[PDB]
Amino acid sequence: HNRLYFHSDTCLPLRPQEMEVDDEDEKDPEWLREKTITQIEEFSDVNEGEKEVMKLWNLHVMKHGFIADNQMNHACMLFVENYGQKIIKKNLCRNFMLHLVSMHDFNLISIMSIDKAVTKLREMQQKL
Amino acid sequence: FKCVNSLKEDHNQPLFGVQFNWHSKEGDPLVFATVGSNRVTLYECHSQGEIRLLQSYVDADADENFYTCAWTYDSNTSHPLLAVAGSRGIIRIINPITMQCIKHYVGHGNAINELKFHPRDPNLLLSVSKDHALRLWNIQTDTLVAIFGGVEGHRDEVLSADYDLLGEKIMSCGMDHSLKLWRINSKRMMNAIKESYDYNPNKTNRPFISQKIHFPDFSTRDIHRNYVDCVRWLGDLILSKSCENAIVCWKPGKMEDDIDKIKPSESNVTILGRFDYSQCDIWYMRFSMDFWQKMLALGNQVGKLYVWDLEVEDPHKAKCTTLTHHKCGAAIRQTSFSRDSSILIAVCDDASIWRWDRL
Amino acid sequence: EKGPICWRKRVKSEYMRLRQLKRFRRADEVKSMFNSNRQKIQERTEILNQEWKQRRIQPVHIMRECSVTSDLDFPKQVIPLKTLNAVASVPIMYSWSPLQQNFMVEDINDEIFVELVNALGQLDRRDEKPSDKIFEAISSMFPDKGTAEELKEKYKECTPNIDGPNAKSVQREQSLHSFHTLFCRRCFKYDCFLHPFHATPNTYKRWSGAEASMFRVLIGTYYDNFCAIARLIGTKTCRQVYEFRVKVYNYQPCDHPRQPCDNSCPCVIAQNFCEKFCQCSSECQNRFPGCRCKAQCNTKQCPCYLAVRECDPDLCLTCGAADHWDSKNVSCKNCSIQRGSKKHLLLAPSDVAGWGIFIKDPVQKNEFISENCGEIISQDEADRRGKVYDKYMCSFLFNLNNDFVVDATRKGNKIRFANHSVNPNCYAKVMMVNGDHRIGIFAKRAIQTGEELFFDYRYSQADA
Ligand SMILES: CCc1cc(C)[nH]c(=O)c1CN1CCc2c(Cl)cc(OC3CCN(C(=O)[C@@H](C)O)CC3)c(Cl)c2C1=O
Ligand SMILES: [Zn+2]
Ligand SMILES: [Zn+2]
Ligand SMILES: [Zn+2]
Ligand SMILES: [Zn+2]
Ligand SMILES: [Zn+2]
Ligand SMILES: [Zn+2]
Ligand SMILES: [Zn+2]
């Protein structure tokens, strides 16, 4: 109190109204979001289908900030709900299945998830 | 062109900026401003090469040193305004009618190398800094619309920037040998400008959210070998210079690629030509143009003043005229064409002003 | 059946022909570009000159004093000098990007050649009154570009997506190759910003071309459950699938197949525990077990805390490290870095010099304030960078371990503004957090509201 503070992102001063709140210190800074999708596109030997799945997966993981292996089964379910409409609309369902098996290969998700997600994607397409 | 006058400011320090008021009505006398030391001087142009000293301002700070200035107007008052800035990284808005410093902006982490007002919106000010970033301000609503810099911003000091004719894009250049394109016609940028005008501090406890623009719409290091200290658009083509005694006319992408269709991933540049001159291998030496973009002028470290006719097709066949005067032997920091191109003013390191009149 | 000296002259002639033509083409394209452009200038400068005409901007008039001297003998002018009222300036700061976690940073043309080859072939064709003699001649004239053997195979001139119209038919390891080599098992991301070493082959070890390649893959995951492989392929049935079948050191995971974690193991050599990421036996004696605490985990009684490690959300199942993902305040007080439960910090000019960081809310002794984030650089990149840094009297470099340095200069978080002091109120503790070294900033003593933060940079500078 009685000291003048500044926003870390603009160096502009704090008004008394704002009451010592500087919060452009968000979990997923926007730029990391564009940096990741930009870096994936830069790949020569990777196709446009595997590219769009990788980008969408990363943005999902970055939004929710998953940190445990135990979170991976729920991470696929949340992905198929939040990004399902986009997966269908962009024709990426086969590359998505390919991602689900990659996850199982990395011992991160159960076989039961590998198909519960696939079941949920079809249930979502039938809604069109 | 003929050297019709030469003036000398008392401070005896380099004059880094010279700018004509291109907002003067038809009939009104030709007024230009000069920045140098911690001073801001205003002059009126008259017949028989007579220059009349009008106004002079001084910063209360002795350690302030102004590098740049820009003219605008109050849309609801019809008053000309003069923005100035330099070493102390502070923008001042001077009203020469009121004879007051009506506004000021502190935000830049270092010195301001260039100030530019949007060609269509007088309230939108672009400031270029040594702190590696550009900043778009809305001087009506006193807010920071955006900060152009970050992860894919300038890795070193930003030396110059320019809006295009319609104000849809900015092209910046700096000490990192880079030229970066920043589209201000994007939905994000237009929404930010719209929202800035709506921002009323007296109706909220929350500050205005500035857009952080980390990525340009194009970037290149392939035009010059050293720092780039000047950039201006020539239509949809770019004119930029370094210390390699040449102004390079180039464009993003391949020969046939339309600027508005250039992707951020674009790895190509096309060099259309160059304007050759000598003894201008020192930095912070700026070229300028005619309102109608038909003339281009640049000064030497030895006081030679080069003027080219851009109207001719290939730049290798470009008509060059070398303006020289026996008494003019200092480094020409900047040039300025009167709106009608009847007058060309040049400012030097020795605190001198040189008036060159057309015909 | 034509002379080598002759063929070399033909190369030189055709090169200079093609090159002169391409040049003349570009010369025109340019003169066209300039014209097309000048109409754009005219059009637009008119738009501006019109806008200008509908404005009647007021003229400037005459106004401690200053004077102006004319060398071209015009009369001296004297005018009063108005003083611009002092404005206070903020301390110096250069551009930087916000980080929430660390960010790793690493330390003739083909167009004309083919034209010329074909332009010469056109002459070999005219010699009736892709030949080998044409390659030996170009190689002779352009030896650098390669031998006639090299230029022959150079002249001749990614797996297609399964969802695309051109979906070819390859193995399981070719359909998955991208996914497998680009995925980071450690942070669950493709082309991650922290882990540069690609996943060891054991980590990813548990009709139409679009159906055929999908079959080879699915019989690697599922094996003989064709009644389920059919459900996934969709466009087929068990019957159809059945028939098809018959036709301090940095931690890095270890992978020594058919070998134990002995004196020859990198983990063991670096004197590091095997983590959940290693490919060794589930029974590996060098693995870190985790803690069975009920709560707290902030005393030597907790093996995690004692080992200068945060809790593992996959091993520490009883303390609360594995739970309540929505909340940042949990039962386990040893997982603040990983969950990112930082404290509110405020930026203001320092009471010493430059910019400083001030805590918003009170903090107890040894309580976690913030993580010190930045770019992860090699000890060499740090040396290169340091040369530049020394010009500005900077040192925002902080050792992480023997291999890496976090550089908060280009990017980091608010704690980059904590100043140096030999009498600090904060300390830096590098902790092992789910296989990653992270610099934690904790209170040295109790800190009250609005207090400036200081830490002793010297302790973060010794790799002595
Ligand atoms: C972490 C920032 C910090 C921390 C604390 C506790 N207190 C503070 O006041 C500040 C602010 N601060 C101090 C002054 C400063 C200088 Cl003098 C040079 C700098 O960085 C060079 C800039 C040219 N560099 C380049 O690479 C150019 C030439 O391309 C190298 C790094 C920087 Cl990054 C800074 C800066 O931000
Ligand atoms: Zn990773
Ligand atoms: Zn091992
Ligand atoms: Zn191991
Ligand atoms: Zn082991
Ligand atoms: Zn515990
Ligand atoms: Zn534990
Ligand atoms: Zn615990």
Author numbering:
A (entry chain T): 561 to 688
B (entry chain F): 68 to 426
C (entry chain A): 9 to 71, 81 to 124, 166 to 180, 193 to 199, 219 to 246, 260 to 308, 432 to 472, 517 to 733
Sentences from the paper on this structure:
PRC2 is composed of four core components: EZH2, EED, SUZ12 and RbAp48, although it may interact with several other proteins. Each catalytic cycle of PRC2 transfers a methyl group from the cofactor S-adenosyl-L-methionine (SAM) to the ɛ-amino group of H3K27. The catalytic machinery of PRC2 resides entirely in the C-terminal SET domain of EZH2, although EZH2 itself is neither stable nor active. Here we report the inhibitor-bound crystal structures of the wild-type (WT) and the oncogenic Y641N PRC2 consisting of human EED, human SUZ12-VEFS and engineered American chameleon (Anolis carolinensis) EZH2 (AcEZH2) subunits.
Interestingly, two of the prominent primary oncogenic mutations identified in lymphoma patients, Y641N and A677G, are positioned in or around the I-SET. Tyr641 and Ala677 are highly conserved among lysine methyltransferases, are structural neighbours in van der Waal's contact with each other and form an axis around which the I-SET ‘swings'. In our attempts to structurally characterize Y641N Hs/AcPRC2, we noticed that the solution behaviour of the mutant three- and five-protein PRC2 is significantly altered relative to the WT: the mutant is prone to dimerization. Monomeric Y641N PRC2 when analysed by HDX-MS shows increased baseline dynamics (of EZH2 subunit Fig. 6a), suggestive of the significant and far-reaching consequences of the substitution. Nonetheless, Y641N HsPRC2_4 does remain sensitive to inhibitors currently in clinical development and the inhibitor 1 reported here, suggesting an overlap of the conformational space between the WT and the Y641N PRC2. This is further underscored by the crystal structure of the Y641N Hs/AcPRC2 in complex with inhibitor 1 reported here. Y641N PRC2, on the other hand with significantly larger change in the sidechain, overwhelmingly favours dimethylated H3K27 as the substrate. The HDX-MS results suggesting greater dynamic character of the Y641N PRC2 and the proclivity of the mutant to dimerize, further emphasizes the far-reaching structural consequences of this specific substitution. Hydrogen/deuterium exchange mass spectroscopy (HDX-MS) analysis of the oncogenic mutant PRC2 suggests that Y641N substitution has far-reaching consequences on the EZH2 protein dynamics rather than just creating a more spacious substrate-binding site.
